[PDB]
Amino acid sequence: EFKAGSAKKGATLFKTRCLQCHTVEKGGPHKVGPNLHGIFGRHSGQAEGYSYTDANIKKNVLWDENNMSEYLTNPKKYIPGTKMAFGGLKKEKDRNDLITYLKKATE
Ligand code: HEC
């Protein structure tokens, strides 16, 4: 159960482990991964102009803070056969910080 974090450390966590494939803001370019704007309160594989794996669309989960934290532990376990080649944010306070920044930077 995620509760709160620091969008300051959450930003520095993103810049090192997320920024290579992703972009936040409104109207951000699709790089390797999709643009994460408005991800919270939006179903998996709904970003316009991006080609997702069948599995990402199959999952059909409304992205919430609890759904995201379970996913960011092991992305390949939560969604099997996904093209997100990321290990995972194992340390919970790392996820809690990231989601706090991600809940703000995705609007
Ligand atoms: C590549 C080097 C990636 C890194 C680092 C991270 N992500 Fe990723 N992500 C990547 C891909 C290729 C995809 C597409 C998934 C597919 O199977 O098609 C994604 C997807 C996401 C999603 C879901 C997208 C959606 O449902 O609309 C999320 C929420 C996501 N990625 C988050 C995320 C975060 C928070 C990361 C770092 C901390 C991160 N990704 C890293 C590729 C890569």
Strand content: under 5%
Shape: globular
Distinct small-molecule ligands in the complex = heme C
Would you list the SSEs in sequence order as H and E? HHHHH
Give the termini distance in whole angstroms: 23 Å
Structural category: mainly alpha
Total individual domains: 1
User: Which value, in Å, is the CA radius of gyration?
Assistant: 13 Å
**Largest β-sheet summary:** none
Number of helices: 5
Number of E strands: 0
Instruction: Work out the oligomeric state of the chains in this entry.
Output: monomer
Task: Kindly state the percentage of residues in helix.
Answer: 25-40%
Modified residues (N6,N6,N6-trimethyllysine): 76-77
GO molecular function: cardiolipin binding; electron transfer activity; heme binding; metal ion binding
GO cellular component, one term: mitochondrial intermembrane space
Family: Belongs to the cytochrome c family.
